[PDB]
Amino acid sequence: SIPKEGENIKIQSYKHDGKIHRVWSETTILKGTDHVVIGGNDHTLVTESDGRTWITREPAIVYFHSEYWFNVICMFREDGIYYYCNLSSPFVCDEEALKYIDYDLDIKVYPNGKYHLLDEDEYEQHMNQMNYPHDIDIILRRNVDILQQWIEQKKGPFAPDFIKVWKERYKKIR
Numbered sequence: 001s002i003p004k005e006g007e008n009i010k011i012q013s014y015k016h017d018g019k020i021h022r023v024w025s026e027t028t029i030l031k032g033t034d035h036v037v038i039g040g041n042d043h044t045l046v047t048e049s050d051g052r053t054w055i056t057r058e059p060a061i062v063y064f065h066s067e068y069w070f071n072v073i074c075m076f077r078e079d080g081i082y083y084y085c086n087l088s089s090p091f092v093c094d095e096e097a098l099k100y101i102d103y104d105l106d107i108k109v110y111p112n113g114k115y116h117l118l119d120e121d122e123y124e125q126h127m128n129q130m131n132y133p134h135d136i137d138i139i140l141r142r143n144v145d146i147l148q149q150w151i152e153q154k155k156g157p158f159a160p161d162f163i164k165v166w167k168e169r170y171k172k173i174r
């Protein structure tokens with residue numbers, strides 16, 4: 001269930017009600033442990049909940065954690081490194097895909113480290129629509145605060161040395 005270095009896997013995002021939200025066709029595994037999966041993608045197919053397919057335009061490093069209720073996409077844009085952070089269940093892997101539940105809230109980090117909390121309105125609506133339990137609401141709000149603290153500390157995927165190491169590892173294996 002821990003994916004192997006050099007494996008190309010699919011990543012599947014679901015909503016709390018079990019419906020698929022988003023699917024990424026191809027991510028090359030750079031690190032796979034008990035607690036952490038790191039991957040790279042570039043010009044992967046992406047499929048939406050209506051079946052429509054689009055293609056990513058720039059390389060990204062993805063970071064998944066088995067304990068924390070978030071995952072992080074590090075995007076290498078012409079105007080600098082952006083992060084897109086999903087509040088989520090932790091991941092599970094199997095032969096089909098790395099899988100997680102998307103919980104609406106996300107954080108955008110700009111190249112200079114400034115962050116914006118996104119989709120608070122969508123989270124409130126979906127939490128009422130899909131009846132998220134109170135404990136999930138407590139966990140997600142706590143993990144918003146943890147993610148902000150990691151961004152401010154440049155911890156984990158937000159470390160400049162993380163980006164230097166994994167950007168170069170992905171550039172070589174691709």
Ligand SMILES: Nc1nc(O)c2ncn([C@H]3O[C@H](COP(=O)(O)OP(O)(O)=S)[C@H](O)[C@@H]3O)c2n1
Pocket residue numbers: 048054084102104119
């Ligand atoms: N070209 C294109 N076409 C689509 O249909 C797209 N759908 C999503 N992207 C985006 O995928 C990422 C996330 O989309 P989002 O922030 O709107 O996600 P949710 O989960 O809040 S709906 C990219 O930032 C990026 O904006 C799409 N990009």
Ligand SMILES: [Mg+2]
Pocket residue numbers: 085086087102103104105106
């Ligand atoms: Mg999200």
Ligand SMILES: [Mg+2]
Pocket residue numbers: 104105106119122
């Ligand atoms: Mg969202």
